[PDB]
Amino acid sequence: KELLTSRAVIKKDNYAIIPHDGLVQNAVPGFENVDISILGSPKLGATFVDYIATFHKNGQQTTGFGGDGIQTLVYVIDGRLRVSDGQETHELEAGGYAYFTPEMKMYLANAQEADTEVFLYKKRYQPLAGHQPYKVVGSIHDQQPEEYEGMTDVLLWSLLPKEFDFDMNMHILSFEPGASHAYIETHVQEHGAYLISGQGMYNLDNEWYPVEKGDYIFMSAYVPQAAYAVGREEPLMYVYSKDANREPEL
């Protein structure tokens, strides 16, 4: 057996790098034939809960995932997934996703026999007079990404409408080798990020760390952050969430 080592970095209410190697299976109610690990959550300092899961043959969520004030979003990293609210159902392929409102529960089922990798997220919805969220189902493959911050070597996908009807959004960033954010950011919004491709050097609280596909990164409110894409076999890509379009409550 190899020496016990880990590149995990956990700094509550600051930031966290959670490599795939240190995860364990959590028994999440409703999930069957699914290996699922809880990643970001309130105890880490996040105001949401996200998960990484591998649906096996006959893998499914049978009791209804979100609901009762909690909105949800699932993103298919690889494979095929069936998502339903009990009335309408959708078949999602890699790159596909579904956002359910805080009133509807999400039921899931692997759409193939082979394993399907999915990223799950939930957040209690914060209402705003005159606005209301609505169900969104789509695929990154049917969307034209934007040049992030006007840069040609960094592409940004936005899964939800940039409207006040929503109190959050989910994005996918893709960097060409050597590319990077235009500057180190410090903002109130949080991020729950899961790397799905490549490698990078990530600045977290002004400390730089090598990161890679399979790594989960939690960025608390205000933590200095930015990254350089590194490696040349594939682009650095990660899906990440963020609270948005609302004001902090006192």
PDB file of C-alpha atoms in Angstrom:
ATOM      1  CA  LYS A   1       0.000   0.000   0.000  1.00  0.00           C
ATOM      2  CA  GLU A   2       1.225   3.502  -0.832  1.00  0.00           C
ATOM      3  CA  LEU A   3       2.049   6.095   1.824  1.00  0.00           C
ATOM      4  CA  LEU A   4      -0.988   8.034   3.006  1.00  0.00           C
ATOM      5  CA  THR A   5      -0.849  11.360   1.146  1.00  0.00           C
ATOM      6  CA  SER A   6      -3.463  13.795  -0.125  1.00  0.00           C
ATOM      7  CA  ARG A   7      -3.523  17.047  -2.066  1.00  0.00           C
ATOM      8  CA  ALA A   8      -6.854  18.035  -0.545  1.00  0.00           C
ATOM      9  CA  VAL A   9      -6.932  21.532   0.960  1.00  0.00           C
ATOM     10  CA  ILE A  10      -9.876  22.345   3.212  1.00  0.00           C
ATOM     11  CA  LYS A  11     -10.274  25.863   4.599  1.00  0.00           C
ATOM     12  CA  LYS A  12     -13.805  26.394   5.914  1.00  0.00           C
ATOM     13  CA  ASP A  13     -15.524  29.571   4.734  1.00  0.00           C
ATOM     14  CA  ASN A  14     -12.499  30.288   2.539  1.00  0.00           C
ATOM     15  CA  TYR A  15     -11.894  27.663  -0.146  1.00  0.00           C
ATOM     16  CA  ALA A  16     -11.466  23.951  -0.644  1.00  0.00           C
ATOM     17  CA  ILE A  17      -9.867  21.662  -3.178  1.00  0.00           C
ATOM     18  CA  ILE A  18     -11.437  18.217  -2.863  1.00  0.00           C
ATOM     19  CA  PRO A  19      -9.674  15.646  -5.082  1.00  0.00           C
ATOM     20  CA  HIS A  20     -11.682  12.641  -6.267  1.00  0.00           C
ATOM     21  CA  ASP A  21      -9.256  10.311  -4.427  1.00  0.00           C
ATOM     22  CA  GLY A  22     -10.498  11.275  -0.963  1.00  0.00           C
ATOM     23  CA  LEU A  23     -14.238  10.900  -1.495  1.00  0.00           C
ATOM     24  CA  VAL A  24     -16.422   8.281   0.177  1.00  0.00           C
ATOM     25  CA  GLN A  25     -19.944   7.103  -0.662  1.00  0.00           C
ATOM     26  CA  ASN A  26     -22.746   8.925   1.160  1.00  0.00           C
ATOM     27  CA  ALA A  27     -26.139   7.286   1.668  1.00  0.00           C
ATOM     28  CA  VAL A  28     -28.322   9.992   0.169  1.00  0.00           C
ATOM     29  CA  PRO A  29     -32.065   9.291   0.576  1.00  0.00           C
ATOM     30  CA  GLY A  30     -33.752   8.206  -2.640  1.00  0.00           C
ATOM     31  CA  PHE A  31     -30.640   7.132  -4.526  1.00  0.00           C
ATOM     32  CA  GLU A  32     -30.324   3.473  -5.532  1.00  0.00           C
ATOM     33  CA  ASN A  33     -27.524   1.807  -7.494  1.00  0.00           C
ATOM     34  CA  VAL A  34     -25.698   5.131  -7.459  1.00  0.00           C
ATOM     35  CA  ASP A  35     -22.291   6.010  -6.015  1.00  0.00           C
ATOM     36  CA  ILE A  36     -22.759   9.576  -4.777  1.00  0.00           C
ATOM     37  CA  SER A  37     -20.579  11.909  -2.706  1.00  0.00           C
ATOM     38  CA  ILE A  38     -21.711  15.157  -1.110  1.00  0.00           C
ATOM     39  CA  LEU A  39     -19.272  17.918  -2.055  1.00  0.00           C
ATOM     40  CA  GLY A  40     -19.995  21.560  -1.264  1.00  0.00           C
ATOM     41  CA  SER A  41     -22.433  22.142   1.613  1.00  0.00           C
ATOM     42  CA  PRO A  42     -23.210  24.540   4.486  1.00  0.00           C
ATOM     43  CA  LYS A  43     -20.623  22.905   6.769  1.00  0.00           C
ATOM     44  CA  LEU A  44     -17.911  23.792   4.250  1.00  0.00           C
ATOM     45  CA  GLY A  45     -19.255  27.340   4.088  1.00  0.00           C
ATOM     46  CA  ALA A  46     -21.379  26.986   0.943  1.00  0.00           C
ATOM     47  CA  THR A  47     -24.962  28.238   0.810  1.00  0.00           C
ATOM     48  CA  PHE A  48     -25.988  25.298  -1.378  1.00  0.00           C
ATOM     49  CA  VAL A  49     -25.265  21.591  -1.687  1.00  0.00           C
ATOM     50  CA  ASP A  50     -23.718  19.930  -4.708  1.00  0.00           C
ATOM     51  CA  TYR A  51     -22.826  16.332  -5.458  1.00  0.00           C
ATOM     52  CA  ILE A  52     -20.849  14.146  -7.815  1.00  0.00           C
ATOM     53  CA  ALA A  53     -22.494  10.852  -8.723  1.00  0.00           C
ATOM     54  CA  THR A  54     -21.992   7.771 -10.858  1.00  0.00           C
ATOM     55  CA  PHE A  55     -25.277   6.147 -11.820  1.00  0.00           C
ATOM     56  CA  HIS A  56     -24.821   2.420 -12.369  1.00  0.00           C
ATOM     57  CA  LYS A  57     -27.158   0.050 -14.213  1.00  0.00           C
ATOM     58  CA  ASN A  58     -30.667   0.705 -12.889  1.00  0.00           C
ATOM     59  CA  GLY A  59     -29.329   3.668 -10.935  1.00  0.00           C
ATOM     60  CA  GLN A  60     -32.022   6.128  -9.906  1.00  0.00           C
ATOM     61  CA  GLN A  61     -33.463   8.667  -7.489  1.00  0.00           C
ATOM     62  CA  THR A  62     -36.998   7.530  -6.671  1.00  0.00           C
ATOM     63  CA  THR A  63     -38.245   9.801  -3.894  1.00  0.00           C
ATOM     64  CA  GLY A  64     -37.873  13.199  -5.547  1.00  0.00           C
ATOM     65  CA  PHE A  65     -34.681  15.221  -5.181  1.00  0.00           C
ATOM     66  CA  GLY A  66     -35.412  18.920  -4.618  1.00  0.00           C
ATOM     67  CA  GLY A  67     -38.665  20.703  -3.879  1.00  0.00           C
ATOM     68  CA  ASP A  68     -40.225  22.492  -0.923  1.00  0.00           C
ATOM     69  CA  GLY A  69     -38.330  25.713  -1.554  1.00  0.00           C
ATOM     70  CA  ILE A  70     -35.190  24.031  -2.874  1.00  0.00           C
ATOM     71  CA  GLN A  71     -34.428  24.352  -6.583  1.00  0.00           C
ATOM     72  CA  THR A  72     -32.253  21.827  -8.383  1.00  0.00           C
ATOM     73  CA  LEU A  73     -30.000  21.367 -11.385  1.00  0.00           C
ATOM     74  CA  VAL A  74     -28.357  18.294 -12.830  1.00  0.00           C
ATOM     75  CA  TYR A  75     -25.609  18.240 -15.457  1.00  0.00           C
ATOM     76  CA  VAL A  76     -24.598  15.103 -17.341  1.00  0.00           C
ATOM     77  CA  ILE A  77     -20.804  14.830 -17.516  1.00  0.00           C
ATOM     78  CA  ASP A  78     -20.902  11.546 -19.412  1.00  0.00           C
ATOM     79  CA  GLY A  79     -23.558   8.994 -20.336  1.00  0.00           C
ATOM     80  CA  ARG A  80     -27.343   9.280 -20.629  1.00  0.00           C
ATOM     81  CA  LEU A  81     -29.783  10.360 -17.933  1.00  0.00           C
ATOM     82  CA  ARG A  82     -33.560  10.484 -17.648  1.00  0.00           C
ATOM     83  CA  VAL A  83     -34.950  13.330 -15.523  1.00  0.00           C
ATOM     84  CA  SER A  84     -38.607  13.810 -14.611  1.00  0.00           C
ATOM     85  CA  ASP A  85     -40.854  15.994 -12.465  1.00  0.00           C
ATOM     86  CA  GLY A  86     -43.517  13.303 -12.431  1.00  0.00           C
ATOM     87  CA  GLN A  87     -45.387  14.755 -15.403  1.00  0.00           C
ATOM     88  CA  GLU A  88     -42.821  15.718 -18.032  1.00  0.00           C
ATOM     89  CA  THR A  89     -39.643  13.750 -18.680  1.00  0.00           C
ATOM     90  CA  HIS A  90     -36.390  14.521 -20.462  1.00  0.00           C
ATOM     91  CA  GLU A  91     -33.611  12.389 -21.894  1.00  0.00           C
ATOM     92  CA  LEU A  92     -30.211  14.013 -21.409  1.00  0.00           C
ATOM     93  CA  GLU A  93     -26.913  13.157 -23.076  1.00  0.00           C
ATOM     94  CA  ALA A  94     -23.429  14.334 -22.104  1.00  0.00           C
ATOM     95  CA  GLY A  95     -23.521  18.120 -21.901  1.00  0.00           C
ATOM     96  CA  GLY A  96     -27.239  18.069 -21.215  1.00  0.00           C
ATOM     97  CA  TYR A  97     -28.800  19.563 -18.103  1.00  0.00           C
ATOM     98  CA  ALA A  98     -32.085  20.320 -16.391  1.00  0.00           C
ATOM     99  CA  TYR A  99     -32.989  23.014 -13.883  1.00  0.00           C
ATOM    100  CA  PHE A 100     -36.106  22.409 -11.772  1.00  0.00           C
ATOM    101  CA  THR A 101     -37.936  25.135  -9.854  1.00  0.00           C
ATOM    102  CA  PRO A 102     -38.182  25.165  -6.025  1.00  0.00           C
ATOM    103  CA  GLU A 103     -41.697  23.712  -6.269  1.00  0.00           C
ATOM    104  CA  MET A 104     -40.956  20.599  -8.338  1.00  0.00           C
ATOM    105  CA  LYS A 105     -39.138  17.465  -7.232  1.00  0.00           C
ATOM    106  CA  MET A 106     -36.608  15.829  -9.518  1.00  0.00           C
ATOM    107  CA  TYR A 107     -36.688  12.089 -10.217  1.00  0.00           C
ATOM    108  CA  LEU A 108     -33.757  10.426 -11.990  1.00  0.00           C
ATOM    109  CA  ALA A 109     -32.821   7.230 -13.808  1.00  0.00           C
ATOM    110  CA  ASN A 110     -29.815   6.085 -15.807  1.00  0.00           C
ATOM    111  CA  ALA A 111     -30.883   6.045 -19.470  1.00  0.00           C
ATOM    112  CA  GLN A 112     -28.271   3.425 -20.399  1.00  0.00           C
ATOM    113  CA  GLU A 113     -26.768   0.301 -18.826  1.00  0.00           C
ATOM    114  CA  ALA A 114     -23.241   1.708 -18.670  1.00  0.00           C
ATOM    115  CA  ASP A 115     -22.319   4.159 -15.909  1.00  0.00           C
ATOM    116  CA  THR A 116     -23.436   7.768 -16.286  1.00  0.00           C
ATOM    117  CA  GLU A 117     -21.560  10.550 -14.497  1.00  0.00           C
ATOM    118  CA  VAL A 118     -23.607  13.510 -13.273  1.00  0.00           C
ATOM    119  CA  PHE A 119     -23.062  16.654 -11.219  1.00  0.00           C
ATOM    120  CA  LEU A 120     -25.973  17.579  -8.937  1.00  0.00           C
ATOM    121  CA  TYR A 121     -26.805  20.886  -7.270  1.00  0.00           C
ATOM    122  CA  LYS A 122     -29.489  22.383  -5.041  1.00  0.00           C
ATOM    123  CA  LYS A 123     -30.082  25.798  -3.492  1.00  0.00           C
ATOM    124  CA  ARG A 124     -32.916  27.256  -1.455  1.00  0.00           C
ATOM    125  CA  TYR A 125     -34.551  29.808  -3.737  1.00  0.00           C
ATOM    126  CA  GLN A 126     -34.523  33.466  -2.691  1.00  0.00           C
ATOM    127  CA  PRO A 127     -37.695  35.177  -3.998  1.00  0.00           C
ATOM    128  CA  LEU A 128     -37.862  38.664  -5.501  1.00  0.00           C
ATOM    129  CA  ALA A 129     -41.052  40.684  -6.042  1.00  0.00           C
ATOM    130  CA  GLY A 130     -42.229  40.574  -9.643  1.00  0.00           C
ATOM    131  CA  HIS A 131     -40.054  37.599 -10.570  1.00  0.00           C
ATOM    132  CA  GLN A 132     -40.280  33.823 -10.605  1.00  0.00           C
ATOM    133  CA  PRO A 133     -38.016  31.075 -11.959  1.00  0.00           C
ATOM    134  CA  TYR A 134     -39.090  28.534 -14.551  1.00  0.00           C
ATOM    135  CA  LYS A 135     -37.897  25.124 -15.680  1.00  0.00           C
ATOM    136  CA  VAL A 136     -34.920  25.064 -18.033  1.00  0.00           C
ATOM    137  CA  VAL A 137     -33.698  22.035 -19.978  1.00  0.00           C
ATOM    138  CA  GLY A 138     -30.918  22.261 -22.530  1.00  0.00           C
ATOM    139  CA  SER A 139     -27.539  21.186 -23.848  1.00  0.00           C
ATOM    140  CA  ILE A 140     -24.203  22.968 -24.124  1.00  0.00           C
ATOM    141  CA  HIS A 141     -23.882  21.413 -27.582  1.00  0.00           C
ATOM    142  CA  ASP A 142     -26.766  23.525 -28.886  1.00  0.00           C
ATOM    143  CA  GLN A 143     -25.356  26.744 -27.474  1.00  0.00           C
ATOM    144  CA  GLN A 144     -22.805  29.179 -28.851  1.00  0.00           C
ATOM    145  CA  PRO A 145     -20.398  30.073 -26.023  1.00  0.00           C
ATOM    146  CA  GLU A 146     -19.311  33.644 -25.335  1.00  0.00           C
ATOM    147  CA  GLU A 147     -15.740  34.885 -25.418  1.00  0.00           C
ATOM    148  CA  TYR A 148     -15.152  35.174 -21.671  1.00  0.00           C
ATOM    149  CA  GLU A 149     -14.223  38.760 -20.792  1.00  0.00           C
ATOM    150  CA  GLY A 150     -13.732  39.377 -24.504  1.00  0.00           C
ATOM    151  CA  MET A 151     -10.866  36.878 -24.681  1.00  0.00           C
ATOM    152  CA  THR A 152     -10.636  34.557 -27.683  1.00  0.00           C
ATOM    153  CA  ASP A 153      -8.921  31.712 -25.815  1.00  0.00           C
ATOM    154  CA  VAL A 154     -11.535  31.330 -23.056  1.00  0.00           C
ATOM    155  CA  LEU A 155     -15.143  30.295 -23.734  1.00  0.00           C
ATOM    156  CA  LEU A 156     -18.128  30.659 -21.416  1.00  0.00           C
ATOM    157  CA  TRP A 157     -21.418  28.748 -21.464  1.00  0.00           C
ATOM    158  CA  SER A 158     -24.337  29.920 -19.304  1.00  0.00           C
ATOM    159  CA  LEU A 159     -27.035  27.327 -18.611  1.00  0.00           C
ATOM    160  CA  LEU A 160     -29.708  29.620 -17.178  1.00  0.00           C
ATOM    161  CA  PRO A 161     -31.131  32.904 -18.452  1.00  0.00           C
ATOM    162  CA  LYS A 162     -29.337  35.966 -17.098  1.00  0.00           C
ATOM    163  CA  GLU A 163     -32.631  37.317 -15.768  1.00  0.00           C
ATOM    164  CA  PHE A 164     -33.896  38.369 -12.343  1.00  0.00           C
ATOM    165  CA  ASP A 165     -36.375  35.487 -12.529  1.00  0.00           C
ATOM    166  CA  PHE A 166     -33.430  33.340 -11.402  1.00  0.00           C
ATOM    167  CA  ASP A 167     -31.355  33.712  -8.218  1.00  0.00           C
ATOM    168  CA  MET A 168     -28.437  31.684  -9.570  1.00  0.00           C
ATOM    169  CA  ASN A 169     -26.773  30.357 -12.700  1.00  0.00           C
ATOM    170  CA  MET A 170     -24.533  27.483 -13.776  1.00  0.00           C
ATOM    171  CA  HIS A 171     -21.686  27.889 -16.218  1.00  0.00           C
ATOM    172  CA  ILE A 172     -18.994  25.972 -18.017  1.00  0.00           C
ATOM    173  CA  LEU A 173     -15.652  27.599 -18.734  1.00  0.00           C
ATOM    174  CA  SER A 174     -13.122  26.224 -21.215  1.00  0.00           C
ATOM    175  CA  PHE A 175      -9.538  27.519 -21.471  1.00  0.00           C
ATOM    176  CA  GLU A 176      -6.945  26.984 -24.188  1.00  0.00           C
ATOM    177  CA  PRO A 177      -3.558  25.932 -22.767  1.00  0.00           C
ATOM    178  CA  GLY A 178      -1.897  28.908 -21.097  1.00  0.00           C
ATOM    179  CA  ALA A 179      -5.084  31.009 -21.203  1.00  0.00           C
ATOM    180  CA  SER A 180      -6.493  32.612 -18.049  1.00  0.00           C
ATOM    181  CA  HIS A 181      -8.982  34.960 -16.389  1.00  0.00           C
ATOM    182  CA  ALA A 182      -8.293  38.626 -17.177  1.00  0.00           C
ATOM    183  CA  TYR A 183      -7.774  39.380 -13.477  1.00  0.00           C
ATOM    184  CA  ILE A 184      -8.061  37.979  -9.941  1.00  0.00           C
ATOM    185  CA  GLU A 185     -11.626  38.384  -8.727  1.00  0.00           C
ATOM    186  CA  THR A 186     -13.032  39.233  -5.332  1.00  0.00           C
ATOM    187  CA  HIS A 187     -16.834  39.199  -5.258  1.00  0.00           C
ATOM    188  CA  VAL A 188     -19.679  38.292  -2.927  1.00  0.00           C
ATOM    189  CA  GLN A 189     -20.923  35.358  -5.069  1.00  0.00           C
ATOM    190  CA  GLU A 190     -19.773  31.824  -4.224  1.00  0.00           C
ATOM    191  CA  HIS A 191     -18.787  29.049  -6.628  1.00  0.00           C
ATOM    192  CA  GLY A 192     -19.017  25.278  -6.490  1.00  0.00           C
ATOM    193  CA  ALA A 193     -16.764  24.033  -9.304  1.00  0.00           C
ATOM    194  CA  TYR A 194     -16.084  20.555 -10.669  1.00  0.00           C
ATOM    195  CA  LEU A 195     -13.275  20.112 -13.211  1.00  0.00           C
ATOM    196  CA  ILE A 196     -14.315  17.887 -16.105  1.00  0.00           C
ATOM    197  CA  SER A 197     -11.316  18.347 -18.383  1.00  0.00           C
ATOM    198  CA  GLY A 198      -7.626  19.249 -18.322  1.00  0.00           C
ATOM    199  CA  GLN A 199      -5.406  20.846 -15.686  1.00  0.00           C
ATOM    200  CA  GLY A 200      -4.629  24.289 -14.338  1.00  0.00           C
ATOM    201  CA  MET A 201      -2.861  26.401 -11.745  1.00  0.00           C
ATOM    202  CA  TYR A 202      -5.612  27.900  -9.613  1.00  0.00           C
ATOM    203  CA  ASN A 203      -5.174  30.972  -7.442  1.00  0.00           C
ATOM    204  CA  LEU A 204      -7.249  30.545  -4.279  1.00  0.00           C
ATOM    205  CA  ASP A 205      -6.856  33.269  -1.659  1.00  0.00           C
ATOM    206  CA  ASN A 206      -3.626  34.213  -3.471  1.00  0.00           C
ATOM    207  CA  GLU A 207      -2.101  30.758  -3.040  1.00  0.00           C
ATOM    208  CA  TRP A 208      -1.554  28.889  -6.344  1.00  0.00           C
ATOM    209  CA  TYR A 209      -2.426  25.178  -6.681  1.00  0.00           C
ATOM    210  CA  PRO A 210      -2.113  22.619  -9.478  1.00  0.00           C
ATOM    211  CA  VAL A 211      -5.635  21.276 -10.127  1.00  0.00           C
ATOM    212  CA  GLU A 212      -7.091  18.687 -12.510  1.00  0.00           C
ATOM    213  CA  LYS A 213     -10.186  16.990 -13.916  1.00  0.00           C
ATOM    214  CA  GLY A 214     -11.894  15.139 -11.065  1.00  0.00           C
ATOM    215  CA  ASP A 215     -11.157  17.910  -8.556  1.00  0.00           C
ATOM    216  CA  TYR A 216     -13.975  19.752  -6.826  1.00  0.00           C
ATOM    217  CA  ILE A 217     -13.253  23.359  -5.910  1.00  0.00           C
ATOM    218  CA  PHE A 218     -15.281  25.430  -3.472  1.00  0.00           C
ATOM    219  CA  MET A 219     -14.788  29.187  -3.601  1.00  0.00           C
ATOM    220  CA  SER A 220     -16.398  31.030  -0.691  1.00  0.00           C
ATOM    221  CA  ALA A 221     -17.683  34.588  -0.976  1.00  0.00           C
ATOM    222  CA  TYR A 222     -14.904  37.117  -1.710  1.00  0.00           C
ATOM    223  CA  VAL A 223     -11.987  34.671  -1.931  1.00  0.00           C
ATOM    224  CA  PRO A 224      -9.381  35.975  -4.415  1.00  0.00           C
ATOM    225  CA  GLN A 225      -9.574  33.673  -7.446  1.00  0.00           C
ATOM    226  CA  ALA A 226      -8.257  33.148 -10.993  1.00  0.00           C
ATOM    227  CA  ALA A 227      -6.503  30.423 -12.971  1.00  0.00           C
ATOM    228  CA  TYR A 228      -4.039  29.598 -15.722  1.00  0.00           C
ATOM    229  CA  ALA A 229      -4.940  26.623 -17.922  1.00  0.00           C
ATOM    230  CA  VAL A 230      -2.042  24.186 -17.977  1.00  0.00           C
ATOM    231  CA  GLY A 231      -1.168  20.998 -19.885  1.00  0.00           C
ATOM    232  CA  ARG A 232      -1.586  20.454 -23.626  1.00  0.00           C
ATOM    233  CA  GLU A 233      -3.586  17.235 -24.084  1.00  0.00           C
ATOM    234  CA  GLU A 234      -6.942  18.915 -23.516  1.00  0.00           C
ATOM    235  CA  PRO A 235      -8.484  22.230 -22.459  1.00  0.00           C
ATOM    236  CA  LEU A 236      -9.150  23.130 -18.837  1.00  0.00           C
ATOM    237  CA  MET A 237     -12.910  22.851 -18.366  1.00  0.00           C
ATOM    238  CA  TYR A 238     -15.151  23.040 -15.344  1.00  0.00           C
ATOM    239  CA  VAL A 239     -18.834  23.385 -14.575  1.00  0.00           C
ATOM    240  CA  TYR A 240     -19.582  25.792 -11.731  1.00  0.00           C
ATOM    241  CA  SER A 241     -22.504  27.381  -9.920  1.00  0.00           C
ATOM    242  CA  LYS A 242     -23.030  30.837  -8.466  1.00  0.00           C
ATOM    243  CA  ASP A 243     -25.692  32.696  -6.532  1.00  0.00           C
ATOM    244  CA  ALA A 244     -26.798  35.814  -8.399  1.00  0.00           C
ATOM    245  CA  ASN A 245     -29.310  38.585  -9.080  1.00  0.00           C
ATOM    246  CA  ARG A 246     -30.190  39.136  -5.434  1.00  0.00           C
ATOM    247  CA  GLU A 247     -29.067  41.186  -2.468  1.00  0.00           C
ATOM    248  CA  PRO A 248     -27.562  39.821   0.745  1.00  0.00           C
ATOM    249  CA  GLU A 249     -30.198  39.444   3.432  1.00  0.00           C
ATOM    250  CA  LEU A 250     -29.692  40.837   6.925  1.00  0.00           C
TER     251      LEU A 250
END
